[PDB]
Design a protein around this nucleic acid. Structure first.
Lengths: 129, 70, 135, 240, 88, 74
RNA sequence: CGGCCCCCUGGACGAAGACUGACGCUCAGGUGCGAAAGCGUGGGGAGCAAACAGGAUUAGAUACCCUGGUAGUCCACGCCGUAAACGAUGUCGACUUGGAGGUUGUGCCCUUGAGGCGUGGCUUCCGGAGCUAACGCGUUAAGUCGACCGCCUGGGGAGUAC
RNA sequence: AGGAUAAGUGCAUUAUGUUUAUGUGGUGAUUUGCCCUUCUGUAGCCA
């Protein structure tokens, strides 16, 4: 049933910003967090916390400029059954580098600027608009 | 067709308005037309459609005043 | 067990048959660990429209519980009973065996508005006033 | 000060009603229904009305012109009392569609009025047939009732005063496209959305809407009384 | 829906010794008793199609939980299929 | 005071008369014309449960001759 | 899917105690199964009716309209499950301001609107974000997306041919 | 033996509209608009 849980993460962020909501909370994962960490530091989300001893749960706050949204959508590219991989030399350019690609490299999850500065390739996860 | 509901004080003229409440409907109302088994649910059951008219008729008196059309 | 609220009426002249018949039907309910939870006799009453002819019949509300297996044989016997004119039994779901909607009108019948006559003595011999043959 | 909050409650215990419908986007300030009558949440409305009255004080010195809109038959007399003078304009015989966007045409029909009244009282059009004079007398009357308290208004007003949105939604729409700062009192089926300061309220109970209007006018107008004397003294430095 | 007296017999013999109804072995046994009763009905009533929907549910889950039980302990599986006397 | 539970004029503006019982004639006649037939449930302002359950309990009651089945029976 | 009732039995909604622990999603093939009539024989036939006769109608009247009137309609098993197989949504699943109706488990109310609140329910109106060419949808999507299958590539001729 | 009583809001040919055969084709009110409209018009434009 739950066949892509990062599509649900991004869809939770998307309805967050479109319905002008301040926070969005959900079930947590090591992958969800690792994507959210690059998004936090590039300011594509504002901040998050992780809490739940029984099962882990993530709460986050949304991308703004003045207090309502300036980013339209965040969508997944590599997905179930159609994984898309890019080389070090082939790391993407998203809105002429105003936007990020979150790229999971062999050394962990980072943004296209740090994968490039590293000279690593990998899986291109999700792009900003 | 004097209508079975009994008139106050018996007389030669049946008082055909004051008697009817729910008579003919559905049993003898679709007279001399072809009879179906399950059709009545969608042909005849028009209660929802008719409640919206009862609400609009009671609403407009007050609103005609409030718009200042009266 | 499941609860089946049976009410029935009986043809006047033939009412002497039921007082023998009732004591086997109750043994078939308690012999299967069911119960008879009231057994109210209503007296003779006037039918609105005749059922198997004649404008009168004699009323009993038995109020049964029994397992599903047994009531199926017992209902097919009552329906093909010549003494019974009609019976109706209502669904199990959310069913009452106490606190009768007719509780005052049953007492009234018995007290003051009955027949006081031999065919409605028989009806009470199949009623709360049970007289029964030895088995 | 805490007095603004005390006013909001004295007025607010009608709670409106409008049966059980209401409008989902006002929900945070809405308590759950008491037996199929809508009942408002009053505690979350008292901060609002005080914040709006503190902002009113400050625009007194920025403004020349108020336009009181959202009038209706029961509240018109209360709008007459809230303007007090000709730095405050009000419409009380209904707003008309395009009165700010097409102010241009109203100001031409105002020029027709002050003329056709000074002609009437002179005796000037009443000659010939009764028809030619009467079709003018009757129109002069329709105009006079509609325009009498907004007749001197030289241009698009500096702020917008809403006491009820139910039929006058359009006055709020156009004002926002002309870039005018909006001061709203919105009812239970209205939305809080898209204006600069809102008081969440309700449209019923003639005793509530009267108290909302008495309060707005004081903050803007005695800020304004002080402003006018100040302005002469400000202007005179230049000419010195 | 099962008779009370079967449901406790099934609990004593099947699942764990905690005497639960949730574990894979006793749910297989609870479906089987409902299947077994129904195939006895389904000697006739050959146009009874809304109840058949149910037959197919109870069979489909029985296949799945036995497939699960072979994905899990091979001991538990080899006992279960032989203690519950399943198929022909 | 608490727990009064169905004094009078309380739960519903039109009282629920029976639910699924049909043995008293007088609860049943609460919604039955002199023509010998049911008034519609939109007109009565009856609660739906008792009415939906009455459709079985009235067919039952006609079949045990507590009620007229038919116009002919006056 | 509509008289009312019993036997056999499915599927759904609530609630406590409690349990196993992705046992999941979709589905080429597939077996199983009908609104209606069609359809093989048995049972059954009251009424209505394709056909068939005749009237009535009229650019002439097979259509229009009427009267007579059979098979058919009704039950049981059996044969390919046909169409307008639908919210004028493929499936299911995850997420998204709500209010109220229709109506239902259940705690509580002066048990004071088919009522309210508390906490679940389907089902539906209303309208805010998004989406549409337009109607329309709107928390059960036709939004935000997710996976997998079915299927289209101008009309006519042809949903037939093969 | 009615525990069924002129009521239960009791109201609208009880929505459903109720007869009349046909008659060919096309046809109307003006750019060449130029592919172009502006980093001094201005805190040059911009994040």
């Amino acid at each position: 049933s739950m066949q892509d849980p990062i599509a649900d993460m991004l869809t939770r962020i998307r309805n967050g910003q479109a319905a002008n909501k301040a926070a969005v909370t959900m079930p947590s994962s090591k992958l969800k967090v690792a994507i959210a960490n690059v998004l936090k530091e590039e300011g594509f989300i504002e901040d998050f916390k992780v809490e739940g001893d029984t099962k882990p749960e993530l709460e986050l706050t949304l991308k703004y400029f003045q207090g309502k949204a300036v980013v339209e959508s965040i969508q997944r590219v590599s997905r179930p059954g159609l994984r898309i991989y890019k080389r070090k030399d082939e790391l993407p350019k998203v809105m002429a580098g105003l936007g990020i690609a979150v790229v999971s490299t062999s050394k962990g999850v980072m943004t296209d600027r740090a994968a490039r500065q590293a000279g690593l390739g990998g899986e291109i996860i999700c792009y900003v608009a | 067709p004097v209508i079975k509901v009994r008139e106050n004080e018996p007389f030669d003229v049946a008082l055909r308005r004051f008697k009817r409440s729910c008579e003919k409907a559905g049993v003898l109302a679709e007279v001399r037309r072809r009879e179906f088994y399950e059709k009545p649910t969608t042909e005849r059951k028009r209660a929802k459609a008719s409640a919206v008219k009862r609400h609009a008729k009671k609403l407009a008196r007050e609103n005609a005043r409030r718009t200042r059309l009266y | 067990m499941r609860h089946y609220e049976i009410v029935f009426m009986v043809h006047p002249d033939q009412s002497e048959q039921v007082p023998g018949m009732i004591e086997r039907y109750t043994a078939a309910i308690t012999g299967a660990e069911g119960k008879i939870h009231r057994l109210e006799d209503w007296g003779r009453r006037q039918l609105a429209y005749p059922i198997n002819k004649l404008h009168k019949a004699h009323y009993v509300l038995m109020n049964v519980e029994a397992p599903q297996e047994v009531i199926d044989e017992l209902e097919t016997t009552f329906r093909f009973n010549d003494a019974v004119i009609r019976s109706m039994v209502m669904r199990t779901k959310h069913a009452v065996t106490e606190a009768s909607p007719m509780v005052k009108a049953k007492d009234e019948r018995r007290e003051r508005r009955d027949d006081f006559a031999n065919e409605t003595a028989d009806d009470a011999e199949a009623g709360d006033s049970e007289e029964e043959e030895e088995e | 000060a805490t007095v603004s909050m005390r006013d909001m409650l004295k007025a607010g215990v009608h709670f409106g009603h409008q049966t059980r419908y209401w409008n989902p986007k006002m929900k945070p300030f809405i308590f759950g229904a008491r037996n199929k009558v809508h009942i408002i949440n009053l505690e979350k409305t008292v901060p609002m009305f005080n914040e709006a009255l503190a902002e009113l004080n400050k625009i007194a010195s920025r403004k020349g012109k108020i336009l009181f809109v959202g009038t209706k038959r029961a509240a018109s007399e209360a709008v007459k009392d809230a303007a007090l003078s000709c730095d405050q304009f009000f419409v009380n015989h209904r707003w008309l569609g395009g009165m700010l966007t097409n102010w241009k045409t109203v100001r031409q029909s105002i020029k027709r009025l002050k003329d056709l009244e000074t002609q009437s009282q002179d005796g000037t059009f009443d000659k010939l047939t009764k028809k030619e004079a009467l079709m003018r007398t009757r129109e002069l009357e329709k105009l006079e009732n509609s325009l009498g308290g907004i007749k001197d208004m030289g241009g698009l007003p500096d702020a917008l005063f809403v006491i009820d949105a139910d039929h006058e939604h359009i006055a709020i729409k156009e004002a926002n496209n002309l870039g005018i700062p909006v001061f709203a009192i919105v009812d239970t089926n209205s939305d809080p959305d898209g204006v600069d300061f809102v008081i969440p309220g309700n449209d019923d109970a003639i005793r509530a809407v009267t108290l909302y209007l008495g309060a707005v006018a004081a903050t803007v107008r005695e800020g304004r009384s002080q402003d006018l004397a100040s302005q002469a003294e400000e202007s005179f430095v230049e000419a010195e | 829906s099962l008779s009370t007296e079967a449901t406790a017999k099934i609990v004593s013999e099947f699942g764990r010794d905690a005497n639960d109804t949730g574990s894979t072995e006793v749910q297989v046994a609870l479906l089987t008793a409902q299947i077994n009763h129904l195939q006895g009905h389904f000697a006739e009533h050959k146009k009874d199609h809304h109840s058949r929907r149910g037959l197919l549910r109870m069979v489909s889950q029985r296949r799945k939980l036995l497939d699960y039980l072979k994905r899990k302990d091979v001991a538990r599986y080899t006992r279960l299929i032989e203690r519950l006397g399943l198929r022909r | 005071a608490r727990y009064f539970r169905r004094r009078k004029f309380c739960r519903f503006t039109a009282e629920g008369v029976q639910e699924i019982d049909y043995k008293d004639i007088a609860t049943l006649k609460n919604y039955i014309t002199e023509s010998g037939k049911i008034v519609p449930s939109r007109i009565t302002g009856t609660r739906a449960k008792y009415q939906r359950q009455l459709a079985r309990a009235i067919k039952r009651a006609r079949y045990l001759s507590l009620l007229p089945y038919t116009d002919r029976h006056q």
